Design a protein around this ligand. Structure first.
Ligand SMILES: Nc1ncnc2c1ncn2[C@@H]1O[C@H](COP(=O)(O)OP(=O)(O)OP(=O)(O)O)[C@@H](O)[C@H]1O
Ligand SMILES: Nc1ncnc2c1ncn2[C@@H]1O[C@H](COP(=O)(O)OP(=O)(O)OP(=O)(O)O)[C@@H](O)[C@H]1O
Ligand SMILES: Nc1ncnc2c1ncn2[C@@H]1O[C@H](COP(=O)(O)OP(=O)(O)OP(=O)(O)O)[C@@H](O)[C@H]1O
Ligand SMILES: Nc1ncnc2c1ncn2[C@@H]1O[C@H](COP(=O)(O)OP(=O)(O)OP(=O)(O)O)[C@@H](O)[C@H]1O
Ligand SMILES: Nc1ncnc2c1ncn2[C@@H]1O[C@H](COP(=O)(O)OP(=O)(O)O)[C@@H](O)[C@H]1O
Ligand SMILES: [Mg+2]
Ligand SMILES: [Mg+2]
Lengths: 297, 269, 570, 24, 265
């Protein structure tokens, strides 16, 4: 439908609303936000799916988190994200979980664990987490999904993957072989050419190789992860306040270019919320009291 | 009343007659059942458990808890019926005979109101009275079980809870899984000591206290195809059943059960 | 009038008599049903939804909206009837005795004219008088439903809409899929607030506003097979019936959370002072049967104290650990000790034999077989052990012998806390403690260098980077390199291993006591830095266990108290 | 070795209920 | 239990119509040991097809009459039961279940019945399926309380495929392994049966025939077991002597073995 005045402004705010969860990754957001602006401006290709992305990049910089920030934007929760964990598909015959069993075999009545997720919700963000860890012909079953926009069920129902936003988060340690100035994206792009079959790469709308999370983005990532433990997990009449030296200490400990934001998340459960969980069980600081976090050293 | 007697067995009347063996232990499990049975809506527990851990024995503990009055007042004077689903399918050649027999059961339960309808082998309910064009007994009970106007205890093996109650995800909602766990060995000794008089009376042998302590530790250590509150009774029986055999009293001891277990797995114990 | 009474429940009369529970929220769908019911040609809303999301509550919310006057003037004063198809089949014996009785129903709806049927369980409609290619209750209604002279609300589980309604797609045309979605956490609080009167009255116990905020949040994150507007009511009633059981007061956050602790097994209740001392004494209670390994005992105690304080991530497991180190130092002893702290037994530990996954294709043991393969009736050897026990310690014993494609099934296990099995059922690993013991010796390097725990921690950390992908070690919370057992730690492991041998002798009605000269001799003959605590285990087997096993059979040591004394030393 | 088992589920051989022809 | 779906093996043993059972006296004691239990008193006879599993029970049914009972098996009638004969004639609903609830009603009323069901691989799936009502769902509540004494008979593979793969059926039937008999045990079987075969064929079977029938059957026949492939040789040789008419020896059982196996002379 033609958009509400609120929904028009939100969808032009779509970059800056997806940046409330995604710190950095600016061209990753404004590649997946333009795909939703195409669908809602009435410029969706009625044969092709709404978006088809390979979110390639380093492990932990927000590949799955952008697919969850997209699913929260379009639905209100990231539990509406259809996440097909492609590490489960290790051989050729688990492709019968995408579209179900053929006739004459058990599991024919249940008809697929991806097709039936989209018959109910045809407007969906369909996440294929760790698509590199699938077999070489799991994703060959998605070569009509990404141009013709439909996947024929084992029971015999073409299901519309046209109004879906398909996301293939591929996962692509320090420096590579040989002499090179500086120190990358073309290494990730051409590894997709060697791993993925270039029938599959032509059907992807945008291949987005993600950035290293910079130190100026880890400082902003500290504020996001402290906002997890406070307010959702400190609804004990407890308030968590961090001094600006304390968030600087977490950023200096959680910052390694090659991983990003999971060493920060392991730092917070090593400096902050395991020392804090010892203070709650001992009731050094307990329910009904504001916690401040001074810098330790 | 008379309708329920021809389609099932009253376990409360069987507990008045002393036909149900004593259930020593399972106090926290029957308390969980009576907690689920005292709900307003979906007051339907399922004793899920490993095969042989005493799933149908917990309900036998409930049937003799009603007679003893150890239940709460919301479950006082309840008549606990093991619903024989084969008795309902029996004589249902024609269309609508099974669905008549099941609605005649439920009309008597709404009339009396003091009926807890224990359905042993609840996985057999999905497909009970299912014919070419029939209504299965699941879909007749699903409005009853959801509103809490039918108190029904189920008892299902964990293997048989995947294949027939989790493959009917609507029916899994109508029940509450009460996990009847495999008990510890010290709990099983108290089970065996409580069942001492039932197997003293049938095998005509005195069974000593060390024999109960052995047959729980010997079964747990040396038998793996069964579960504790059964493979321990199994060693008590073939102890005492051999003494009825070879004598055509002699106490059952540690030596009398170890020679059963030696002739059981082939393990010299 | 009374034709519909003997085959259906008058649901509008149930709302006048107040027999229907108050349907608070899901009124954007009651108006959606009335938009479908006020249509012309096909005015038959099927309420599809996950089992328990309040599909049949919307119509109960509709039948209340009839008599409240919330209904518009196109459905004003329409008696709704929940038609029992089982009651239509019952009382039939002969041919036509179903099809006559269904035409008696539709003759009355034509006559009375303000009837809205509610076929609860609309999948029951196909095959209700005969097979699908014959005259049944579906084939009679299909000329009536497409004309629009019969208004019939359906309600079907989404899993049973694709299996029975979509299987014969002529009936699917006559109905409009009115998608009844699962409530949010914020929405099912106010569902519980309207239902509070009906469950405070039945259980005669008050229900705190906090307890329904609790029963919405605790049912969302700690139940992963049911749906919210039903699994939250389960926590309210079972705590409501727990309070009226013990009093034969009120219902708190703790009263809800101890129901969920007895329903899942997950300890989500507020810890009592006697128990939370043991949580602070977790290291000292883990050290009762592990010796040394202090950085690992701290690391798995931090993961459980973070879990009991409620500071763990709700979308991740309780702890993800790799226990790397030399063999025998307590990689698996600790994972059993952690499973005895949390449960009491070490067979509650989910030991995954990960060395027998050396084939590149045994990953189907972890999530079952896909559809079209036997092993579909079994959901898997890992998913079905956590579908039963969500709070677990899942030990992956000796991970470095498996293929790289077994690790990849466990990636989303660690980050998302999910593992969808082959038959389509995601299983929460969000409450498990995932232990990955890795066995990754000679007391030199290869070549010329200046150099236990020194040049072994940085050695095995680089052997995990080499064997694993850096995405797996990214998802693991803590990697703990384990110490080689020192001499003063083997002396205390004599005390642990003899006390099982003496524990084997308590069943023989005796006890074994060792001298300080003899415990030293077992420790001097049981010390090996590169194989630790198994050469101590073999030394006690070679010098204590079998020599006492002979002296039992000589009748030399019967049930008298044997003290094992040193031969000679120093 | 990687030879797949092909479950091959049969169609349901099930019972049939009856409409009956009424007689005196 | 009616004589429609089986027959009374103790009433046959009282009239002496059952085969004399020489040997298997240790296996009958193990069946009596399982039948004398208060709960789970259900001995399944695990043995290869035709090793004498009914001959255990035919000797057990004689031991009811001979008085070798443990006083809990005293005056117990033993009706055999073809489980597949209850299956036969079921195309409509409640055909199998009515005839199974009738024969279990006639055990509670009568009160001394010991069913011998053969083919317990047929027990799993006697009806439509396990979620449907089969005989592996009707018998199971009474097989755990000892209110129903059923003596089973599987092979070993049928026990592995159908009972050991069935949860909650391993615990209700207690295994009694009827082994494959040796060559001297098989001769002693034939020495006891010869008063039946010499009185039915009206021939005389010599002692040299049976020492050959227990040796040549193991030597030449491998698709079928001994306590049947040796009984058969002195059975058909008595019939071939009745047909050609009298004395059976190791030459009369000789050409009987040459009839089947691909031996020209
Ligand atoms: N861009 C980001 N914005 C916010 N948080 C981030 C971001 N990147 C990483 N994080 C933090 O670290 C976690 C890892 O992010 P995410 O789940 O997207 O990993 P990923 O990039 O998919 O890595 P992998 O290669 O392991 O799949 C997030 O859940 C969050 O806690
Ligand atoms: N707590 C207990 N007290 C006394 N006896 C017990 C107890 N638990 C089990 N038993 C006994 O152990 C046996 C267990 O069999 P029962 O049928 O009761 O359990 P089950 O696990 O439901 O088995 P099945 O799945 O085969 O029905 C019975 O003899 C029962 O009386
Ligand atoms: N919006 C709602 N407001 C109040 N109570 C609700 C609401 N939705 C569901 N319920 C409650 O849910 C309970 C019964 O479950 P529910 O009605 O959700 O089942 P359902 O969605 O019809 O599922 P199924 O298809 O399995 O029958 C009742 O206590 C009912 O009051
Ligand atoms: N730290 C320890 N504390 C207690 N017992 C230990 C310890 N280390 C080893 N043991 C003992 O050693 C034996 C086996 O060690 P454990 O089960 O811990 O294996 P592990 O450390 O995983 O090593 P691996 O898998 O390489 O054999 C057990 O008897 C155990 O009690
Ligand atoms: N002691 C015995 N042991 C075994 N079979 C015997 C014995 N005595 C007689 N038989 C013969 O056993 C046969 C009965 O069938 P049986 O061997 O029990 O079959 P199955 O072993 O397949 O149950 C008859 O030929 C009978 O004469
Ligand atoms: Mg990821
Ligand atoms: Mg419903």
């Amino acid at each position: 439908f033609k958009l509400t005045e609120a929904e028009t402004t939100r969808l032009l705010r779509m970059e800056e609303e997806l940046h409330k969860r995604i710190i950095g990754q600016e061209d990753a957001v404004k590649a997946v936000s333009k795909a939703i602006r195409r669908t809602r401006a009435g410029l969706k290709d009625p044969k092709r799916p709404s978006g088809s992305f390979i979110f390639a990049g380093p492990s932990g910089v927000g590949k799955t988190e952008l697919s969850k920030a997209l699913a929260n934007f379009l639905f209100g929760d990231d539990d509406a994200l259809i996440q097909i964990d492609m590490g489960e598909f290790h051989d050729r015959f688990t492709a019968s979980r995408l579209f179900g069993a053929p006739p004459g075999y058990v599991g024919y009545e249940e008809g697929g664990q991806l097709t039936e997720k989209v018959r109910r919700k045809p407007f969906s963000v369909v996440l294929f987490d760790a698509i590199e860890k699938a077999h070489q012909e799991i994703y060959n079953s998605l070569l009509q999904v990404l141009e013709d926009g439909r996947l024929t069920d084992g029971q015999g129902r073409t299901v519309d993957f046209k109004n879906t936003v398909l996301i293939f988060t591929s996962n692509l340690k320090p420096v590579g072989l040989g002499f090179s100035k500086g120190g990358m994206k073309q290494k990730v792009n051409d590894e997709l050419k060697k791993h993925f079959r270039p029938e599959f790469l032509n059907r992807i709308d945008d291949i987005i190789v993600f950035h290293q999370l910079t130190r100026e983005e880890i400082i902003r990532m500290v504020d996001l992860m402290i906002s997890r433990v406070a307010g959702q997990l400190k609804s004990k009449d407890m308030a968590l306040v961090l001094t600006d030296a304390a968030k600087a200490l977490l950023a200096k400990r959680g910052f390694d270019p090659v991983l990003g934001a999971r060493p920060l998340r392991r730092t917070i459960q090593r400096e902050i919320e395991d020392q804090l969980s010892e203070k709650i069980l001992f009731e050094e600081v307990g329910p009904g009291q504001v916690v401040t976090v001074d810098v330790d050293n | 009343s008379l309708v329920l007697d021809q389609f099932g067995r009253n376990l409360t009347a069987a507990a008045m007659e002393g036909k149900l063996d004593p259930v020593i232990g399972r106090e926290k499990e029957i308390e969980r059942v009576m907690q689920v049975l005292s709900r307003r809506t979906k007051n339907n527990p399922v004793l899920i458990g490993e095969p042989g851990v005493g799933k149908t024995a917990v309900v036998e503990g409930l049937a003799q808890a009603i007679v003893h009055g150890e239940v709460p007042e919301t479950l006082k004077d309840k008549q606990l019926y093991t619903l024989d689903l084969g008795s309902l399918v029996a004589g249902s050649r024609y269309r609508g005979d099974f669905e008549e027999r099941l609605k005649k059961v439920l009309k008597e339960i709404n009339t009396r109101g003091d009926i807890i309808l224990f359905i042993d082998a609840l996985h057999t309910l999905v497909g009970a009275g299912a014919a070419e064009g029939a209504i299965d007994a699941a879909s007749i009970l699903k409005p009853k079980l959801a509103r809490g106007e039918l108190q029904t205890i189920g008892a299902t093996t964990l293997d048989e809870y995947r294949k027939y109650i989790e493959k009917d995800a609507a029916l899994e909602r109508r029940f509450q899984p009460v996990q009847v766990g495999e008990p510890t060995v010290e709990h099983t000794i108290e089970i065996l000591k409580g069942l001492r008089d039932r197997y003293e009376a049938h095998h005509r042998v005195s069974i000593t206290d060390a024999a109960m302590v052995a047959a729980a530790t010997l079964a747990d250590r040396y038998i793996n195809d069964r579960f504790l509150p059964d493979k321990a009774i199994d060693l008590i029986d073939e102890a005492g059943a051999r003494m009825r055999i070879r004598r055509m009293v002699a106490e059952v001891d540690d030596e009398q059960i170890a020679e059963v277990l030696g002739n059981w797995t082939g393990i010299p114990v | 009038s009374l034709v519909l009474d003997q085959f259906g429940r008058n649901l509008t009369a149930a709302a006048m008599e107040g027999k229907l529970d108050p349907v608070i929220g899901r009124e954007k769908e009651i108006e959606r049903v009335m938009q479908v019911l006020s249509r012309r040609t096909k005015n038959n809303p099927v309420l599809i939804g996950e089992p328990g999301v309040g599909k049949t509550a919307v119509v109960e919310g509709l039948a209340q909206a009839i008599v409240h006057g919330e209904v518009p003037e196109t459905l004003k004063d329409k008696q709704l009837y929940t038609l029992d198809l089982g009651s239509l089949v019952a009382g039939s014996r002969y041919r036509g005795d179903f099809e006559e009785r269904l035409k008696k129903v539709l003759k009355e709806i034509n006559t009375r004219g303000d009837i809205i049927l509610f076929i609860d369980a609309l999948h029951t409609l196909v095959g209700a008088g005969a097979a699908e290619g014959a005259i049944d209750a579906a084939s009679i209604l299909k000329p009536k439903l497409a004309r629009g002279e019969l208004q019939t609300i359906g309600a079907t589980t989404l899993d049973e809409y694709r299996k029975y309604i979509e299987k014969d797609a002529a009936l699917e045309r006559r109905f409009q899929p009115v998608q009844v979605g699962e409530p949010t956490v914020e929405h099912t609080i106010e569902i519980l607030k309207g239902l509070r009167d009906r469950y405070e009255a039945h259980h005669r116990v008050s229900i705190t506003d906090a307890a329904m905020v609790a029963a919405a949040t605790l049912a969302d994150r700690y139940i992963n097979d049911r749906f919210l507007p039903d699994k939250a009511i389960d926590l309210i009633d079972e705590a409501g019936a727990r309070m009226r059981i013990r009093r034969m007061a009120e219902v708190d956050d703790e009263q809800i959370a101890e129901v969920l602790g007895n329903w899942t097994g997950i300890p989500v209740f507020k810890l009592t002072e006697a128990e939370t001392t043991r949580l602070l004494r977790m290291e000292e209670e883990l050290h009762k049967r592990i010796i040394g390994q202090e950085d690992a005992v701290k690391a798995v105690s931090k993961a459980i104290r973070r879990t009991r304080a409620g500071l763990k991530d709700p979308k991740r497991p309780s702890g993800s650990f790799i226990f790397a180190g030399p063999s025998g130092v307590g990689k698996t002893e600790l994972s059993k000790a952690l499973a005895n702290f949390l449960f009491g037994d070490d067979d509650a530990l989910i030991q995954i034999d990960m060395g027998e996954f050396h084939d590149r294709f045994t990953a189907s043991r972890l999530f079952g077989a896909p559809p079209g393969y036997v092993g579909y009736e079994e959901g898997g050897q890992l998913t079905e052990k956590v579908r039963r026990k969500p709070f677990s310690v899942v030990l992956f014993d000796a991970i470095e012998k498996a293929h790289q494609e077994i690790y990849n099934s466990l990636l989303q296990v660690l980050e998302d806390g999910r593992l969808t099995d082959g038959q389509g059922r995601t299983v929460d690993f969000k409450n498990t403690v995932l232990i990955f013991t890795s066995n990754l010796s000679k007391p030199v390097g290869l070549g010329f260098s200046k150099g236990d725990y020194e040049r072994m921690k940085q050695k095995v950390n680089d052997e995990l980077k080499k064997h694993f992908r850096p995405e797996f070690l990214n998802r693991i919370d803590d990697i703990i390199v384990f110490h080689q057992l020192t001499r003063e730690e083997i002396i205390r492991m004599v005390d642990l291993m003899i006390s099982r041998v003496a524990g084997q002798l308590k069943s023989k009605d005796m006890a074994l006591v060792l001298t300080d000269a003899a415990k030293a001799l077992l420790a001097k003959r049981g010390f090996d830095p590169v194989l630790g605590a198994r050469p101590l285990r073999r030394t006690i087997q070679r010098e204590i266990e079998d020599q006492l096993s002979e002296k039992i059979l000589f009748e030399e040591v019967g049930p008298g108290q044997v003290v094992t004394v040193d031969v000679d030393n120093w | 070795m990687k030879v797949l088992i092909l479950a091959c589920l049969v169609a349901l051989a099930l019972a049939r209920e009856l409409e009956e022809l009424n007689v005196p």
